[PDB]
């Protein structure tokens, strides 16, 4: 069992690297998801101010 | 020994995991093996469970052992300098100044109730700020003791200089 522990430790290290890459891809997806979820807020206030300008 | 201990004894701090077992008694507990399996049956066990910490990364754990070893060596050198100043002051008694009973109790009873109690250290910050605050407090206490010991030595030298002029 010389290469079996290196193979299981290599698979566990690949699972830990995939677990770290899932968190890094989750934070990188959330970084664009903050602006993607924040860019839609102006579309309601612009029409809400356009209603107040259309009243006058 | 019998020249450095008058109210306290020798202690050994060791930690083992939950799956560890001894090689001389397989199939027993480490808690019952600590007292019952001790040499002569007179070994006393004291609780030293501190609070749990959160590891930030694996890279800081390697430098944390060297920083804790250097801070432990600086704390031991500061305790040796404070003991050297207390022995140099000519006020150490046969029991006090060589045992250091904290809280007016023995070292085994105080060490058995030691649960990582702090007065300015909380369980929400990192261990590096607590070790840096403890090293800064130990360096401030050692510098405060050395600053008074230097003025006491200069005052004793001036008192010996005035005593030599007063008569001789």
């Amino acid at each position: 069992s010389q290469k079996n522990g290196i193979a299981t430790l290599l698979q566990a290290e690949k699972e830990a690297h995939e677990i770290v890459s899932k968190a890094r891809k989750y934070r990188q997806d959330k970084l664009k998801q903050a602006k993607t979820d924040a860019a839609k807020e102006i579309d309601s206030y612009k029409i809400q101010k356009d209603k107040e300008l259309k009243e006058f | 020994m019998a020249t450095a201990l008058y109210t306290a004894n020798d202690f050994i701090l060791i930690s083992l995991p939950q799956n560890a077992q001894p090689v001389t008694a397989p199939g027993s507990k480490t808690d019952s093996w600590f007292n019952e399996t001790l040499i002569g049956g007179r070994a006393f066990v004291s609780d030293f469970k501190i609070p749990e910490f959160k590891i930030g990364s694996l890279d800081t754990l390697i430098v944390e052992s060297e920083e804790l070893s250097k801070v432990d060596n600086q704390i031991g050198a500061s305790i040796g300098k404070i003991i050297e100043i207390l022995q140099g002051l000519n006020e150490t008694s046969t029991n006090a100044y060589r045992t250091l009973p904290i809280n007016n109790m023995p070292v085994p009873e105080y060490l058995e109730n030691f649960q990582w109690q702090t007065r300015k250290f909380k369980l929400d910050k990192s261990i590096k700020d607590l070790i840096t605050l403890i090293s800064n407090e130990s360096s401030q206490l050692d510098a405060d003791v050395r600053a008074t010991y230097a003025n006491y030595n200069s005052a004793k030298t001036n008192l010996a200089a005035a005593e030599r002029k007063k008569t001789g």
């Binding site: 290469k3 290599l10 | 890279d59």
Partner: protein, 113 residues
């Protein structure tokens, strides 16, 4: 080998190096195991005089292992050969070792003549 499993890309980090005594590798494995956690290995390979050592550690502590490995009387690095721009580097090292033998043979024949 310790088939392509470590010279063609993997998730684990290996530390290969030549040493003339196994006691320095045992003391380096004891110092690395006592001061850096379970981030060591135990391998032994006979060579032509030096002994082949086999060490394994994490991929984020390769910089700290160079100072402890260099200060422990050893040259355990990430790659022994200077050819690592492809998979595997032993194919290019076999070509450089296949041309350096002919250049050294021609230089030895011209120097002897």
């Amino acid at each position: 080998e310790f088939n392509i499993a470590a010279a063609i890309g993997a998730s684990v980090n290996y530390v290969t190096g030549v040493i003339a005594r196994d006691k320095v590798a045992t003391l380096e494995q004891i110092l690395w195991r006592v001061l850096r956690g379970n981030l060591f290995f135990k391998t032994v390979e006979i060579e032509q005089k030096n002994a082949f050592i086999v060490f394994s550690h994490g991929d984020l502590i390769i910089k700290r292992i160079r100072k402890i490995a260099e200060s422990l009387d050893a040259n355990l690095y990430d790659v022994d050969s200077s050819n690592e721009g492809r998979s595997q580097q032993l194919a290019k090292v076999n070509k450089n070792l296949s041309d350096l033998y002919t250049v050294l043979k021609t230089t030895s024949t011209t120097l002897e003549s």
